[PDB]
Design a protein around this motif. Structure first.
Motif, PDB file in Angstrom:
ATOM      1  N   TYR A 143       0.933  -1.062  -0.063  1.00  0.00           N
ATOM      2  CA  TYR A 143      -0.106  -0.035   0.038  1.00  0.00           C
ATOM      3  C   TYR A 143       0.718   1.155  -0.056  1.00  0.00           C
ATOM      4  N   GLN A 144       0.518   2.121  -1.013  1.00  0.00           N
ATOM      5  CA  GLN A 144       1.277   3.449  -1.051  1.00  0.00           C
ATOM      6  C   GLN A 144       0.301   4.666  -0.658  1.00  0.00           C
ATOM      7  N   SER A 145       0.612   5.274   0.165  1.00  0.00           N
ATOM      8  CA  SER A 145      -0.151   6.242   0.736  1.00  0.00           C
ATOM      9  C   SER A 145      -0.511   7.376  -0.231  1.00  0.00           C
ATOM     10  N   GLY A 146      -1.367   8.291  -0.055  1.00  0.00           N
ATOM     11  CA  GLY A 146      -1.599   9.305  -0.623  1.00  0.00           C
ATOM     12  C   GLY A 146      -1.955   9.200  -2.096  1.00  0.00           C
ATOM     13  N   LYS A 147      -2.354   8.049  -2.534  1.00  0.00           N
ATOM     14  CA  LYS A 147      -2.930   7.666  -4.024  1.00  0.00           C
ATOM     15  C   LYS A 147      -4.197   7.352  -4.182  1.00  0.00           C
ATOM     16  N   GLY A 148      -5.075   7.887  -2.815  1.00  0.00           N
ATOM     17  CA  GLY A 148      -6.441   7.323  -2.775  1.00  0.00           C
ATOM     18  C   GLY A 148      -7.388   8.327  -3.800  1.00  0.00           C
ATOM     19  N   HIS A 149      -6.976   8.536  -5.051  1.00  0.00           N
ATOM     20  CA  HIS A 149      -7.771   9.035  -5.743  1.00  0.00           C
ATOM     21  C   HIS A 149      -7.926   8.618  -7.104  1.00  0.00           C
ATOM     22  N   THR A 150      -7.204   7.517  -7.347  1.00  0.00           N
ATOM     23  CA  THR A 150      -7.332   6.594  -8.699  1.00  0.00           C
ATOM     24  C   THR A 150      -6.891   5.047  -8.094  1.00  0.00           C
ATOM     25  N   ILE A 151      -7.561   4.031  -8.720  1.00  0.00           N
ATOM     26  CA  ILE A 151      -7.094   2.616  -8.792  1.00  0.00           C
ATOM     27  C   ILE A 151      -5.778   2.409  -8.759  1.00  0.00           C
ATOM     28  N   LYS A 206     -19.576 -21.535   2.303  1.00  0.00           N
ATOM     29  CA  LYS A 206     -20.548 -20.592   1.755  1.00  0.00           C
ATOM     30  C   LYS A 206     -21.801 -21.085   2.313  1.00  0.00           C
ATOM     31  N   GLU A 207     -22.228 -22.122   2.386  1.00  0.00           N
ATOM     32  CA  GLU A 207     -23.630 -22.455   2.665  1.00  0.00           C
ATOM     33  C   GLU A 207     -23.973 -22.084   4.361  1.00  0.00           C
ATOM     34  N   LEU A 208     -22.897 -21.971   5.126  1.00  0.00           N
ATOM     35  CA  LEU A 208     -23.259 -21.456   6.305  1.00  0.00           C
ATOM     36  C   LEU A 208     -23.238 -20.102   6.424  1.00  0.00           C
ATOM     37  N   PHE A 209     -22.611 -19.387   5.420  1.00  0.00           N
ATOM     38  CA  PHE A 209     -22.668 -17.946   5.161  1.00  0.00           C
ATOM     39  C   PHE A 209     -24.261 -17.650   4.939  1.00  0.00           C
ATOM     40  N   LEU A 210     -24.638 -18.452   4.026  1.00  0.00           N
ATOM     41  CA  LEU A 210     -26.098 -17.725   3.539  1.00  0.00           C
ATOM     42  C   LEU A 210     -27.103 -18.409   4.365  1.00  0.00           C
ATOM     43  N   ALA A 211     -26.923 -18.095   5.586  1.00  0.00           N
ATOM     44  CA  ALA A 211     -27.873 -18.404   6.849  1.00  0.00           C
ATOM     45  C   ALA A 211     -27.892 -17.201   8.117  1.00  0.00           C
ATOM     46  N   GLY A 212     -26.486 -16.604   8.112  1.00  0.00           N
ATOM     47  CA  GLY A 212     -26.081 -15.633   8.971  1.00  0.00           C
ATOM     48  C   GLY A 212     -25.294 -16.190  10.426  1.00  0.00           C
ATOM     49  N   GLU A 213     -24.647 -16.982  10.247  1.00  0.00           N
ATOM     50  CA  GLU A 213     -23.832 -17.727  11.191  1.00  0.00           C
ATOM     51  C   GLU A 213     -22.400 -17.104  11.196  1.00  0.00           C
ATOM     52  N   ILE A 214     -21.826 -17.055  10.063  1.00  0.00           N
ATOM     53  CA  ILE A 214     -20.584 -16.692   9.852  1.00  0.00           C
ATOM     54  C   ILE A 214     -20.388 -15.689   8.994  1.00  0.00           C
ATOM     55  N   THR A 215     -19.864 -14.320   9.277  1.00  0.00           N
ATOM     56  CA  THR A 215     -19.550 -13.314   8.310  1.00  0.00           C
ATOM     57  C   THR A 215     -18.020 -12.912   8.126  1.00  0.00           C
ATOM     58  N   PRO A 216     -17.684 -13.120   7.127  1.00  0.00           N
ATOM     59  CA  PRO A 216     -16.245 -12.710   6.775  1.00  0.00           C
ATOM     60  C   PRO A 216     -15.872 -11.430   6.904  1.00  0.00           C
ATOM     61  N   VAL A 217     -14.750 -10.914   7.190  1.00  0.00           N
ATOM     62  CA  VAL A 217     -14.239  -9.637   7.210  1.00  0.00           C
ATOM     63  C   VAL A 217     -13.490  -9.293   6.181  1.00  0.00           C
ATOM     64  N   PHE A 218     -13.258  -7.918   5.794  1.00  0.00           N
ATOM     65  CA  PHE A 218     -12.092  -7.486   5.056  1.00  0.00           C
ATOM     66  C   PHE A 218     -11.526  -6.252   5.347  1.00  0.00           C
ATOM     67  N   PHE A 219     -10.197  -6.246   5.989  1.00  0.00           N
ATOM     68  CA  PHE A 219      -9.722  -5.047   6.282  1.00  0.00           C
ATOM     69  C   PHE A 219      -9.402  -4.190   5.163  1.00  0.00           C
ATOM     70  N   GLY A 220      -9.001  -2.830   5.320  1.00  0.00           N
ATOM     71  CA  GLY A 220      -8.574  -2.050   4.573  1.00  0.00           C
ATOM     72  C   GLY A 220      -8.811  -0.703   4.745  1.00  0.00           C
ATOM     73  N   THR A 221      -8.679   0.348   3.908  1.00  0.00           N
ATOM     74  CA  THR A 221      -8.870   1.750   4.276  1.00  0.00           C
ATOM     75  C   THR A 221      -9.373   2.367   2.945  1.00  0.00           C
ATOM     76  N   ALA A 222     -10.695   3.110   3.519  1.00  0.00           N
ATOM     77  CA  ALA A 222     -11.555   3.812   2.493  1.00  0.00           C
ATOM     78  C   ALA A 222     -10.661   4.709   1.738  1.00  0.00           C
ATOM     79  N   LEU A 223     -10.079   5.832   2.472  1.00  0.00           N
ATOM     80  CA  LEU A 223      -9.397   6.672   1.771  1.00  0.00           C
ATOM     81  C   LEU A 223      -8.127   6.207   1.104  1.00  0.00           C
ATOM     82  N   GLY A 224      -7.715   5.195   1.662  1.00  0.00           N
ATOM     83  CA  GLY A 224      -6.647   4.493   0.804  1.00  0.00           C
ATOM     84  C   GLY A 224      -6.886   3.712  -0.708  1.00  0.00           C
ATOM     85  N   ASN A 225      -8.277   3.692  -0.821  1.00  0.00           N
ATOM     86  CA  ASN A 225      -8.618   2.941  -1.866  1.00  0.00           C
ATOM     87  C   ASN A 225      -7.842   1.631  -1.992  1.00  0.00           C
ATOM     88  N   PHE A 226      -7.889   1.096  -0.883  1.00  0.00           N
ATOM     89  CA  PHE A 226      -6.991  -0.272  -0.823  1.00  0.00           C
ATOM     90  C   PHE A 226      -7.930  -1.424  -0.662  1.00  0.00           C
TER      91      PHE A 226
END
Ligand SMILES: Nc1nc2c(ncn2[C@@H]2O[C@H](COP(=O)(O)OP(=O)(O)CP(=O)(O)O)[C@@H](O)[C@H]2O)c(=O)[nH]1
Ligand SMILES: [Mg+2]
Ligand SMILES: [Mg+2]
Ligand SMILES: [Mg+2]
Ligand SMILES: [Mg+2]
Ligand SMILES: [Mg+2]
Ligand SMILES: [Mg+2]
Ligand SMILES: [Mg+2]
Ligand SMILES: [Mg+2]
Ligand SMILES: [Mg+2]
Ligand SMILES: [Mg+2]
Ligand SMILES: [Mg+2]
Length: 132
Positions: free
Chosen positions: A60-68, A110-130
């Motif tokens: 991740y390179q900072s200060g690039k959060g205005h383009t992919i 996946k099947e246990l996901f489609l009932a509401g017992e396991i939710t995966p997370v995804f870390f990241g930063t919105a301003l960093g577009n990461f």
RNA sequence: GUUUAGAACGUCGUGAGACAGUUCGGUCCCUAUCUGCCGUGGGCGCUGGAGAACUGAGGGGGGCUGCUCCUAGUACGAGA
């Protein structure tokens, strides 16, 4: 009972130690969690994210959060290129953090996901577009 | 501007005139001897005479600062 898949936004600024954050989620609001990406340190030193199922790592390179931005990959966990690209500052913490979360947490189906017992997370930063 | 000689207003005095009251006009000299300062030369000295290259006791000069971007919209902040 709709499915849910969280996303820990605003990772640029100093976060609470993420592991208890994951536990606070999966016990305070009972949903049960299973991470997919783990972040290599937070704050002024947030360097990259380590995917758990693609078994790679991104950077991740900072200060690039205005383009992919283009992904730089250091594929492979124990690849010493990583420990030379992030530094034993955080790599040696990453190893045992992973081996402490994989054993003590859940996995994804996946099947246990489609009932509401396991939710995966995804870390990241919105301003960093990461993590998006 | 004030501070001469001309002239007019307001005011004062019988009057000549007067008023930190106003109004228009109105001659400003000097070739630098000494000290001082800025430059530039001649004499002698430095122990036989001459041509260069240095050393460095000391002295002077110079020392100003604004906007923009990265770190970063990060630390801080409930937010602004
Ligand atoms: N550094 C950083 N700040 C972020 C990020 N995402 C949100 N923020 C913070 O939040 C602000 C934007 O908030 P926003 O996502 O619009 O909030 P919202 O949920 O729409 C507000 P409401 O609840 O009223 O709908 C940014 O100015 C910044 O301060 C991110 O990825 N990085
Ligand atoms: Mg006079
Ligand atoms: Mg007269
Ligand atoms: Mg005349
Ligand atoms: Mg003379
Ligand atoms: Mg004298
Ligand atoms: Mg003289
Ligand atoms: Mg002289
Ligand atoms: Mg000379
Ligand atoms: Mg001489
Ligand atoms: Mg000297
Ligand atoms: Mg000086």
């Amino acid at each position: 009972d709709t499915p849910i898949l969280t996303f820990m936004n605003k990772l640029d600024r100093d976060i609470r130690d993420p592991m208890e954050l994951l536990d606070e989620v999966e016990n305070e609001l009972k949903i049960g969690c299973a991470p997919i990406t783990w972040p290599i340190g937070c704050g002024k030193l947030f360097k990259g994210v380590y995917h758990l199922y693609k078994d790679e790592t991104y950077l991740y390179q900072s200060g690039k959060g205005h383009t992919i931005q283009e992904v730089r990959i250091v594929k492979g966990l124990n690849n010493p290129d990583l420990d030379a690209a992030v530094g034993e500052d955080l790599a040696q913490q990453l190893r045992d953090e992973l081996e402490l979360v994989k054993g003590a947490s859940n996995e994804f189906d996946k099947e246990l996901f489609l009932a509401g017992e396991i939710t995966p997370v995804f870390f990241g930063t919105a301003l960093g577009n990461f993590g998006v």
